[PDB]
């Protein structure tokens, strides 16, 4: 019905937790009414910052159902 308001967030590098375990960081591109969030230059954060972190793809889309909290690391 109503679109979520991310309007200040887009183009800013953002960390968001996928499910209980996961945390993905990427530059937010677009979003929809289900909160499905597509972002680019995705990276999967882990305990060891440079080591266990591995990039996903040039463009990644996320189902809004697996989104828990969304924090922007940015202005």
């Amino acid at each position: 019905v109503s679109t979520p308001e991310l309007k200040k967030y887009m183009d800013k590098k953002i960390l968001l937790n996928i499910n209980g375990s996961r945390k993905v960081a990427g530059i937010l591109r677009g979003y929809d009414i289900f909160l499905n969030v597509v972002l680019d230059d995705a990276m999967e954060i882990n305990g060891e910052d440079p080591a266990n972190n591995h990039q996903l793809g040039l463009q990644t889309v996320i189902r809004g159902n697996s989104i828990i909290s969304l924090e922007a690391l940015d202005a």
């Binding site: 019905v1 109503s2 979520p4 308001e5 991310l6 967030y9 937790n17 209980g20 909160l35 809004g64 159902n65 989104i67 828990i68 909290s69 969304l70 924090e71 922007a72």
Partner: protein, 81 residues
């Protein structure tokens, strides 16, 4: 419904959040929608295991929210007439 309208009445005030993942986000509420998904400003975070951090801005999905703590003085607010 009244429960969501009270959340809209709590904008700009310090509120507490319990996500169903077990964490606790206490801080100032900037935005809220009728889907109960809110965004909070200058918020202290408590992980499910107790580790506490601080983040400037946060957006949470309403489906993952469990309870929201609202400043008590909203109890007598006109919604409940």
């Amino acid at each position: 419904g009244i429960p969501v309208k009270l959340l809209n009445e709590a904008q700009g005030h310090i509120v507490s959040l319990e996500l169903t993942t077990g964490a606790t986000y206490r801080g100032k509420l900037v935005e809220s929608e009728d889907s109960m998904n809110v965004q909070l400003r200058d918020v202290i975070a408590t992980e499910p295991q107790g580790a506490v951090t601080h983040m400037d801005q946060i957006f949470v999905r309403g489906s993952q929210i469990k309870f929201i703590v609202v400043p008590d003085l909203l109890k007598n607010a006109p919604l409940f007439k």
